C-alpha cells in the first residue's frame, strides 16, 4: 500500500495567513492525487484533483502543486470557513489510500482554563462505582496536562478525557477528565485532586476534595 | 490511474 | 442537484452482517464509479472498494476481500455495501462517494453520501444512568459556579441532552461521548451559571435516548453541608 504522510499534522493560523500543507508519498503516484477538506460531522469535500486542477465550486485561494512523491496544497488569504482538516489521496494503484490529515485551527490569545472538580454523587456510589470529574472550561491553546493525584499518588490508566471542538464564538476549548474507580478502590483513599498545567497558568492549579466530607 | 471499465 | 442518500444507522452484534444502501439522484447513476470509504471515531479515511454501476464490476481492498461485497440495482439507482463477519473493529461511519471518473479512471470523489453509522458490539441496548455534577460553595470561581450531569453507561449512541427543556443554552458544553472499557458510552454536560443565585435558580438536565425509548430528567442542586 502507498503511505501518504502529511505535514504538519496540526497547525494554528489566523485569518489572512497563507498555509502550506505537504503530502509525501512512499512511492511515485504521478499526478493521480486529490485533496479534500473535512469539517466535524460532515463528509469530505473535494478541492483539487489531477494534483493541481481546482474543483468547481472551490475558491481560487486554494491551489496545489507537485508530482511523483511530493505534493503541496496552499491556502492563501485564509478565511474563517477554511479552518478544517485537510487530506490527500492517491489513486495510482490499489488500494486507494488517504493521508493522515492536517488540522488547521484558529489562533487567539492565551486563555487559562477555569478548573472545577466534582466528587461522585451519593446516588452513583450506591451502585458500586465512583466517577470523579475534572472540568477545564474555555481555554486556549488546546494543549493541557491534567493529572489525577489520589493521596499524593499519581494515577494512570483509570481516566478518560473528552474535548470539545474549538468554539465558533470565542475560539476556546473545554475539556473533561473523568477518573473512574470501583467503589472498593475509591474507598481505599481520602484526598482526590486534579492538577492542571496550561500555558495561561503561571503555576499548575489543583482542585481537590476529601472523600466523605 | 486505476479504472473499473466503461460506463457508456 | 447531484446527491447520494444513504440508509440509516445500524447496530449489530459481532459475527452479524450489515447492508448499507446508497441511492443516487440528479445524475445518471451508471455514468460514474462509486466508492465506499469508512471513518472510525477520531480516525482518518479508509477505502473499502469501488463499483462500476453500469457493469457491476468491483474492486475490493485486500483486507476486505471475501468479507465485503458491493452490488447495485439500476432500477432504483441504488448501490449496496454488505459487510459480513462483523467485529467491533468495523464500528465506523460508512460513506458512498461518486468519482468524477473522467476517461473511465479514478480522478476524485466529488459527491458524497451523508454517511451511515454502523456500531458493532456485544453490548445490548441500554438507557443511561444520569447523575448530578452538583455545584458547591467550595468550588466557586469568581462569580461563577459550574454544574452538570454525568450521563453514564448507555448503548448505542446517541443521547440528546438539553437543560430546562431548552430554555438554558448559554454556557452549556455537552462533551463528545467516550466509549468506556465496559463497551458502554458515557458523556457529561456542564453549564456555568452565577454563584450568587444558586439558592433560587432551577437546573434540570433532560437526557433522551431514542434506542431505549427513554426520557430522563435530573435536577441539579447546590451541595449543602449538615
Set out the domains of chain C in order of their start, with CATH numbers.
3-120 (2.60.40.10), 129-219 (2.60.40.10)
Q: How far apart are CA A173 and CA A111, in angstroms?
A: 10
Report which of A167, A162, A80, A145 is spatially closest to residue C171, judged by C-alpha positions.
A167
**Hey, what's the cell of A13?**
493560523
Q: Is C218 helix (H, G, I), strand (E, B) or coil?
A: strand
> CB–CB of A174/C173 below 8 Å?
yes
Q: How far apart are CA C177 and CA A162, in angstroms?
A: 7
- The β-bridge partners of C194 are C144
Number of helices and strands in chain A (H, E): 2, 19
- Residues in contact with C209: Cβ distance below 8 Å, sequence separation at least 6, in sequence order: C127, C128, C154, C158, C159, C160, C215
Nearest CA in chain C to B4: C52
How would you class A202 by CB atoms within 10 Å of its CB: exposed for 0-12, middle for 13-18, buried for 19 or more?
exposed
Report which of C61, C67, C103, C96 is spatially closest to residue C82, judged by C-alpha positions.
C67
Q: Calculate ∠ Cα C220-A147-A123, nearest 5°.
A: 30
**Hey, what's the cell of C2?**
447531484
- The β-bridge partners of C72 are C79
- The β-bridge partners of C151 are C130, C187
Q: Calculate ∠ Cα C199-C214-C183, nearest 5°.
A: 100
Set out the domains of chain A in order of their start, with CATH numbers.
4-106 (2.60.40.10), 114-210 (2.60.40.10)
Q: Which strand (E) or helix (H) includes residue A4?
A: strand A4-7
Q: Which strand (E) or helix (H) includes residue A176?
A: strand A173-182
CB of A97 less than 8 A from some CB of C: yes
Please report the residues numbered 1 through 8 in chain B whose beta carbons come closer than 8 angstroms to any beta carbon of chain C. 1-8
Nearest CA in chain B to A93: B2
Please report the residues numbered 56 through 75 in chain A whose beta carbons come closer than 8 angstroms to any beta carbon of chain C. none
How would you class B4 by CB atoms within 10 Å of its CB: exposed for 0-12, middle for 13-18, buried for 19 or more?
buried
> CB–CB of C51/C70 below 8 Å?
yes
Do C52 and B1 make contact, defined as CB atoms within 8 angstroms? no
Q: Tell me which DSSP letter residue A154 carries.
A: E
Would the CA dihedral through A106, A169, A165, A112 be positive or negative?
positive
Do C52 and B4 make contact, defined as CB atoms within 8 angstroms? yes
| Whole-number Cα distances in Å, A71 to A6, A109, B1, C56, C136 | 9, 32, 17, 34, 55
Do B1 and A94 make contact, defined as CB atoms within 8 angstroms? no
Query: In sequence order, what DSSP letters do the residues of C8-36 get, joined into one string?
Result: --EEE-TT--EEEEEEEESS-GGGS-EEE
By residue count, chain A amounts to: 213
Q: How far apart are CA C5 and CA C28, in angstroms?
A: 15
Q: What are phi and psi of A123, to 5 degrees?
A: -60, -45
Q: How far apart are CA C64 and CA C47, in angstroms?
A: 10
CB of A127 less than 8 A from some CB of B: no
CB of C51 less than 8 A from some CB of B: yes
Q: Is A136 helix (H, G, I), strand (E, B) or coil?
A: strand
Residues of A in contact with C188 (CB under 8 A): 133, 135, 162, 176, 178
Q: Determination technique for this PDB entry?
A: X-ray
Q: Tell me which DSSP letter residue A99 carries.
A: -
> CB–CB of C172/C191 below 8 Å?
yes
CB of C62 less than 8 A from some CB of B: no
Q: How far apart are CA A129 and CA A148, in angstroms?
A: 17
Residues of C in contact with B4 (CB under 8 A): 33, 50-52, 55, 57-59, 104
Q: How far apart are CA A52 and CA A72, in angstroms?
A: 9
Residues of B in contact with C59 (CB under 8 A): 2, 4
> CB–CB of C121/C155 below 8 Å?
yes
**Hey, what's the cell of A29?**
503516484
Q: How far apart are CA C148 and CA C132, in angstroms?
A: 6
How many of the other CB atoms lie within 10 Å of CB of C169? 10
| Whole-number Cα distances in Å, A121 to A102, A179, A183, C6 | 40, 13, 12, 42
How many of the other CB atoms lie within 10 Å of CB of A91? 27
Q: Is C104 helix (H, G, I), strand (E, B) or coil?
A: helix
Nearest CA in chain A to C139: A116
How many of the other CB atoms lie within 10 Å of CB of A59? 13
- The β-bridge partners of A24 are A5, A70
Phi-psi sector, C142: left (phi>0), alpha (psi -120 to 50), beta: left
Q: Tell me which DSSP letter residue A213 carries.
A: -
- The β-bridge partners of C217 are C206
**Hey, what's the cell of C44?**
482518518
Calculate the CA A49 to chain-centre distance.
27
Beta strands in chain C (DSSP E): 3-6, 10-12, 18-25, 34-39, 46-51, 58-60, 68-73, 78-83, 92-99, 109-112, 116-120, 129-133, 144-154, 160-163, 172-174, 178-179, 185-194, 204-209, 214-219
> CB–CB of C77/C24 below 8 Å?
yes
Calculate the CA C212 to chain-centre distance.
16
Q: How far apart are CA A81 and CA A59, in angstroms?
A: 11
Q: How far apart are CA C90 and CA C39, in angstroms?
A: 10
Q: How far apart are CA C161 and CA C205, in angstroms?
A: 7
Do A96 and B1 make contact, defined as CB atoms within 8 angstroms? no
Q: What are phi and psi of C154, to 5 degrees?
A: -115, 160
In this complex, which of C31, C57, C106 lies closest to B5 when CB atoms are compared? C57
What is the 3-class SS of A29-94, one letter each residue? CCCCEEEEEECCCCCCEEEEECCCEECCCCCCCEEEEEECCEEEEEECCCCHHHCCEEEEEECCCC
- Residues in contact with A120: Cβ distance below 8 Å, sequence separation at least 6, in sequence order: A129, A130, A131, A132, A186, C131
Q: How far apart are CA C128 and CA C134, in angstroms?
A: 18
| Whole-number Cα distances in Å, A100 to A18, A33, A201, C44, C165 | 21, 14, 32, 6, 40
Report which of A206, A204, A180 is spatially closest to residue A117, judged by C-alpha positions.
A206
Q: How far apart are CA C136 and CA A133, in angstroms?
A: 14
Please report the residues numbered 1 through 30 in chain A whose beta carbons come closer than 8 angstroms to any beta carbon of chain C. none
Would the CA dihedral through B4, B5, C3, C4 be positive or negative?
negative
Cis peptide bond upstream of A141, omega within 30:
yes
Q: Which strand (E) or helix (H) includes residue A6?
A: strand A4-7
Residue in the block written with cell 509525501: A24
Q: Which strand (E) or helix (H) includes residue A125?
A: helix A122-125
Å from A71 to nearest chain C CA? Answer: 16
Neighbour subunits, A (≥3 Cβ pairs < 8 A):
B, C
Interface A-B, measured as beta-carbon pairs within 8 A, has a size of 8
**Hey, what's the cell of C122?**
456485544
Q: Calculate ∠ Cα A173-C164-A212, nearest 5°.
A: 70
Do A43 and C95 make contact, defined as CB atoms within 8 angstroms? yes
- Residues in contact with C214: Cβ distance below 8 Å, sequence separation at least 6, in sequence order: C127, C128, C208
Amino acid at each position: 500500500d502507498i503511505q501518504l504522510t502529511q505535514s504538519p499534522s496540526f497547525l494554528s493560523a489566523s485569518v489572512g495567513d497563507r498555509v502550506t500543507i505537504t503530502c509525501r508519498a512512499s512511492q511515485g503516484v504521478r499526478n493521480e492525487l486529490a485533496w479534500y477538506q473535512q469539517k466535524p460531522g460532515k463528509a469530505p469535500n473535494l478541492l483539487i484533483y489531477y494534483a493541481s486542477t481546482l474543483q468547481s465550486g472551490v475558491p481560487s485561494r486554494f491551489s496545489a502543486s507537485g508530482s511523483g512523491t511530493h505534493f503541496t496544497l496552499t491556502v492563501s488569504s485564509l478565511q474563517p470557513e477554511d479552518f478544517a482538516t485537510y487530506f490527500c489521496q492517491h489513486m495510482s494503484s490499489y488500494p486507494l489510500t488517504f493521508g493522515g490529515g492536517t488540522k488547521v485551527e484558529i489562533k487567539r490569545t492565551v486563555a487559562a482554563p477555569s478548573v472545577f472538580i466534582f466528587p461522585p454523587s451519593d446516588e452513583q456510589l450506591k451502585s458500586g462505582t465512583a466517577s470523579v470529574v475534572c472540568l477545564l472550561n474555555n481555554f486556549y491553546p488546546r494543549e493541557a496536562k491534567v493529572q489525577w493525584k489520589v493521596d499524593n499518588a499519581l494515577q494512570s490508566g483509570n481516566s478518560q478525557e473528552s474535548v470539545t471542538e474549538q468554539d465558533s464564538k470565542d475560539s476556546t476549548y473545554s475539556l473533561s477528565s473523568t477518573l473512574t474507580l470501583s467503589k472498593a478502590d475509591y474507598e481505599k483513599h481520602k484526598v482526590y485532586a486534579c492538577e492542571v498545567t496550561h500555558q495561561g497558568l503561571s503555576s499548575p492549579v489543583t482542585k481537590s476534595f476529601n472523600r466523605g466530607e | 490511474a486505476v479504472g473499473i471499465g466503461a460506463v457508456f | 442537484q447531484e446527491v447520494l442518500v444513504q440508509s440509516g444507522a445500524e447496530v449489530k452484534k459481532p459475527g452479524a452482517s450489515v447492508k448499507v444502501s446508497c441511492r443516487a439522484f440528479g445524475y445518471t447513476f451508471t455514468g460514474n464509479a462509486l466508492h465506499w470509504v469508512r471513518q472510525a471515531p477520531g480516525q482518518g479515511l479508509e477505502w473499502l472498494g469501488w463499483i462500476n454501476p453500469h457493469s457491476g464490476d468491483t474492486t475490493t481492498s485486500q483486507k476486505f476481500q471475501g468479507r465485503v461485497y458491493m452490488t447495485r440495482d439500476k432500477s432504483i439507482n441504488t448501490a449496496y455495501l454488505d459487510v459480513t463477519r462483523l467485529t467491533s473493529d468495523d464500528t465506523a461511519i460508512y460513506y458512498c462517494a461518486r468519482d468524477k471518473y473522467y476517461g473511465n479512471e479514478a480522478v476524485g470523489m466529488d459527491v458524497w453520501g451523508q454517511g451511515t453509522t454502523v456500531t458493532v458490539s456485544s453490548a445490548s441496548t441500554k438507557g443511561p444512568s444520569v447523575f448530578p455534577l452538583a455545584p458547591s460553595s467550595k468550588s466557586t470561581s469568581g462569580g461563577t459556579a459550574a454544574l452538570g450531569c454525568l450521563v453514564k453507561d448507555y448503548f448505542p449512541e446517541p443521547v440528546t441532552v438539553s437543560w430546562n427543556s431548552g430554555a438554558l443554552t448559554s454556557g452549556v458544553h455537552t462533551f463528545p461521548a467516550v466509549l468506556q472499557s465496559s463497551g458502554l458510552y458515557s458523556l457529561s454536560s456542564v453549564v456555568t451559571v452565577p454563584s450568587s443565585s444558586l439558592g433560587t435558580q432551577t437546573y434540570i438536565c433532560n437526557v433522551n435516548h431514542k434506542p431505549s425509548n427513554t426520557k430522563v430528567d435530573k435536577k441539579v442542586e447546590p451541595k449543602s453541608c449538615d
